[PDB]
Structures are given as structure tokens and as C-alpha cells.
Design a protein around this ligand. Sequence first.
Ligand SMILES: [Cl-]
Ligand code: NA
Lengths: 105, 85, 163
Amino acid sequence: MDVFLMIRRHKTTIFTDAKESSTVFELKRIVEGILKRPPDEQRLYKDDQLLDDGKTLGECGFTSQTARPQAPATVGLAFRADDTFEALCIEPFSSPPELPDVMKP
Amino acid sequence: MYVKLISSDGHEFIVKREHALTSGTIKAMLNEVNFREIPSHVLSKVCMYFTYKVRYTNSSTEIPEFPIAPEIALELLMAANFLDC
Amino acid sequence: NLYFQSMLVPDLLQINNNPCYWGVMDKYAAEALLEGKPEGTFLLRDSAQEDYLFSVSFRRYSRSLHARIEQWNHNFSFDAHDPCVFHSPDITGLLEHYKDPSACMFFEPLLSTPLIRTFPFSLQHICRTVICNCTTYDGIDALPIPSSMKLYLKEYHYKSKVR
Ligand SMILES: [Cl-]
Ligand code: NA
């Protein structure tokens, strides 16, 4: 069972997938190959809840119904700055404009 | 393995190369690609399409809807047309 | 009328969410998909004829048969000008009527087992279906897009000669 994710930090988003049975730590290994920071130097978040390295993604609530290719689940990410971790911060996307009147109910 | 597509507002999207090659414009112009006319609320959505396109190509199942909100539909139409996908 | 009004297929997003619909495909390609298949196996596709948007291709009497969808007075049917023949304000309802095999007559299509599309459409097409669903044909002209794109959004229309 593949689950589809957006890992987000500042103005960065990673589109990737992993098995439901893979661990949060294994996801940190995916991120290490891309962003070049080891697992011990990352916090992964579901909303504002820091996740457990040893839990599976399905156990954290990432599933078929929840993390779909066309509507992936967001995982937050924060790096360690020296001894301390930086605050989880995700810069939002731009806003669409008002709907044209011909396109309204 | 991965490529970076940067939107007009500076958002950086890391997606798999195989999925980005779903766009003919991107396939033709290939690590990094800058899109000075496509903003992040549209590019994020395009990325989601690339995953949908690749995963439901030769589908093992009935294919679900790609949800698009009317509010981004026109920009998404023009970016899809510009990206050739 | 001695003129016609262009009108968006009202049902267009439903049709495109219906997995029995395969988009641009000719009758030879339908015949390849349907080859050998049991009575009532069917698909909806675009008709390659200029005056019709859609056709069904289906199986009956061990033959791959086709039926163009006609319109008149804002209804769709397989004979638009014979009002004895069943019609619907929707493409979806016209398929739904011919779903039940023991209630299909020999001269009527039999559309009981849909053949399911195995690839996704283009992102451009998917946006179109959503935009068309919010707007009307005349509304397309007031959109802030080039007219090449207005041309594209207007593709799935029918010609209304009635009022
Ligand atoms: Cl199509
Ligand atoms: Na046609």
C-alpha cells in the first residue's frame, strides 16, 4: 500500500511516496538523500504533533484514504540548529483570485 | 531521481524526474527549472497531477477523480496547456 | 429556428467522472476493446463524426455495434426526431435507461456492463470539464483567457435550433 506525501519546510515541498508499513525513520532516510540532513537532525510532524521514529506511517494515520496521489498528506519538517531544533514553520502557498462572475452559482 | 521546480513566488517543489517528465515542456527542457509565470498554488497542484498521471497510467483499478476547485481552474488550465500535460 | 444556439453539454463533468467514458476514440479502437466480449459490454466515447459529440459502442448478437447520440429540444437520444423513442435531458440518464437487459428491445442498445477506462485524461482536459460545469457557453466569452482557449472550452457543445 503506497501512501503519497508532501514533506514541507519553509518554501520547500517534497512530493514522495512510501509504503504504509514503512517507519517514520525510514521516511527521514528518504529526506536525508534529498536534503542532506541526517535523521537525528530532523523532526517530522503531522500537523503540530511530532511523530515517533519507530511507528509506521499507517499507525500515524497516513493511509489509502488519507494520502492519495491526487491529494497527498502533508508531513511537516524542522531541522536542528546547533543543539536546539528550529520551530516548525511552513510558508503557505499563494492565494487564488476572486472567481469570475460567469463562474459563480 | 529528483528535480526541483520553482514557482513564481519562490516555492521550491522537489518531485521525481520520472513524474516531471509527464510534462512535455519539462521533458523537452531537461536539476532545476524556474517558472516565472506559474505561482505556488498552481504548481503544487500540477505536481499532484504528475503523481496521479503516473500512478493511474496502466491502472490496476478504476481511476478516481482529480479534484480541482473552481477558484484555481483557469490558472491551472493555462499552466496545463503551457506545460503540455 | 432558422439559426442555432450553441450550448454546453449539461452533463459534461458527470460524464468525465464516469469510468465507462473513453474520450477521443474511433469505432475501430472500440471494436478492438470490445472484441469477443459478452452481450451488453459497452463504452461511451467521442464520435468521430463532425455533427455528433458522443457514441456508444456495445456488444449484442455477437457483434460490435455502435449508436450515435443525437440531441433535440435539449434532450438526448439515439433517435432525436422520433419522440416515441426514449430521451433524457442528460447523457447520463440516457445510458441509465438502457442498463437493464430483460427490459431492452431488439432494436435498442444494451448497455449493461461498462468497460472501464484504464488511463487518466490530460490535466488540461480535466480543468476544462470543471470550468464548463460552472459556466455557460456565452459565459466562456467573458473569461480572462486567450481565444485559443475559449475555442477549447467550447468544444463540447450541441447546436440548439429550438425555442
Ligand atoms: Cl478527451
Ligand atoms: Na464528434
